Amino acid sequence: AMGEAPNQALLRILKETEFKKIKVLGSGAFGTVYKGLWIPEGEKVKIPVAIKELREATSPKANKEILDEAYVMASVDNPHVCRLLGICLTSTVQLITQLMPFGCLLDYVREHKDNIGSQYLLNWCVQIAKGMNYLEDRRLVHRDLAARNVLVKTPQHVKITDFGLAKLLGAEEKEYHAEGGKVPIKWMALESILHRIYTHQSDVWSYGVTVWELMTFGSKPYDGIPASEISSILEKGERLPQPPICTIDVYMIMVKCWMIDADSRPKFRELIIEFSKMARDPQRYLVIQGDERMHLPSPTDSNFYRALMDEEDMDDVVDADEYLIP
Ligand SMILES: C[C@@H](Nc1ncnc2ccc(-c3cnc(Cl)c(NS(C)(=O)=O)c3)cc12)c1ccccc1
Ligand SMILES: [Cl-]
C-alpha cells in the first residue's frame, strides 16, 4: 500500500434466526440495545451477545454512522477493547457484540461504591490504558472515552467500547479535524473544544477525566456547570479537584493528562507502567475506608454464570473471547 496497510478484518453477516432470547437493556431516540444469545448454525455453542439497532432506517446520516461504528469495531482485536461479532441485515442494521453482563463501569462504580477497593480501581486504570494504547497502535482516536463507554465483562476485566465517534489517522497524519456534531465537552481536551483538533493526546485528556470519574465513584465532572462555560474555566487554568481517596501520586497523573501542551501529557504506554507500579501496592496510592476487607464477584463463584444464564442454556454457553475463527 502507498498509504496505511490494508484492513483485512472480516465482517461477518449474521442471520436473524441465529439469535434467541432477545431482551431490552436500554433505549433512546436513535435506537435500542438488547441482550440475547447467538447460536451459529450447527456449532453447538451459545454466545451471550449485545445487539444494537437504530429505531428506523430513515436517516442517511444515522445509517452511515452505525456502519462506520461497525467498521471500527470489526477492525479491533485486543482483550481491553470490545470487538464486533458481526452485523445482521434486517430492516434495521443491527450490530452484534459480546455481552458485557455487568454493564458500564460508571454505573458499576456508583452501584457498588461501598465494596470497591483500591486494587480494583488501579487495575481498571491499567486495563483502560492498555486498551487505549492498542487503539493508538492501530492509529485510532476514540474521541468519546468516558466511564460510560467502558464496559465490565467481570469485575476483574473491563473493555473500551462505543466507537461511534472514532476516527482513523492516515499513515503520516497527526491530527483529526472535525466540524459540527454533538460533542461531550466535559471529557474533551481544550484544543478539541477550541479548534476541533483530535489526537491520541486528546484521548489522554479524556482518560484523565475517566480516571477522575472512577476515583470519585462516578461523580459528574464539573457538576452544575453549563457546557458553554467549560472552555473558559479550562483557559483560566481550572481543573477537576483532587478526589478524597487520591494520593498526590495519583492526582498528579490526572493533572498531567490535562496540561495545555498535548505532547507534554503522558503517553498511554507510560500510564500502563505507572498505574501498574501503583497496582502492586494499591493502599500506598489510594486511601479507602475499609479497603482491606473488600471483595467483588469472580467467575469462580457458584451463581456467577447462573445469575446471567438460564440453566437450560448453560451446557453449551461459550464466552465470545473463547469463540475464535481463523
Ligand atoms: C455500545 C455497546 N454496548 C454493550 N456492548 C456489550 N455488552 C453490553 C452489555 C450491557 C449494555 C448495557 C446497555 N444499556 C444499558 Cl442501559 C445498560 N445498563 S448498565 C448495567 O446500568 O450499564 C447496559 C451494553 C452493552 C454495543 C456495541 C455494539 C452492539 C451492541 C452493544
Ligand atoms: Cl451521569
Residue numbers in the entry: 694 to 1019
Sentences from the paper on this structure:
We leveraged this flipped binding mode of the quinazoline core between EGFR and PI3Kγ to computationally design potent and selective dual inhibitors of both enzyme families. X-ray crystal structures of EGFR and PI3Kγ cocomplexed with MTX-531 confirmed the postulated reversed binding mode of MTX-531 to each target. The 1-position of the quinazoline ring in MTX-531 forms a key hydrogen bond with the backbone amide of M793 of EGFR. The substitution at the 4-position fits into a hydrophobic pocket formed by the aliphatic side chains of K745 and T790, whereas the hydrophilic group at the 6-position faces outward to a solvent-accessible area of EGFR. All studies described here were carried out with the (R)-isomer, which is ~100-fold more potent against EGFR and ~10-fold less potent against PI3K than the (S)-isomer. Collectively, the observed binding mode is consistent with these isomeric potency differences. The methyl substituent of MTX-531 in the (S)-isomer is oriented toward a sterically restricted area of EGFR, thus hindering binding. MTX-531 exhibits low-nanomolar potency against purified EGFR and PI3Kα with half-maximal inhibitory concentration (IC50) values of 15 nM and 6.4 nM, respectively. Only four of 432 kinases tested were found to exhibit an IC50 < 1 μM and none came within tenfold of MTX-531’s on-target potency against EGFR (IC50 ≈ 15 nM).
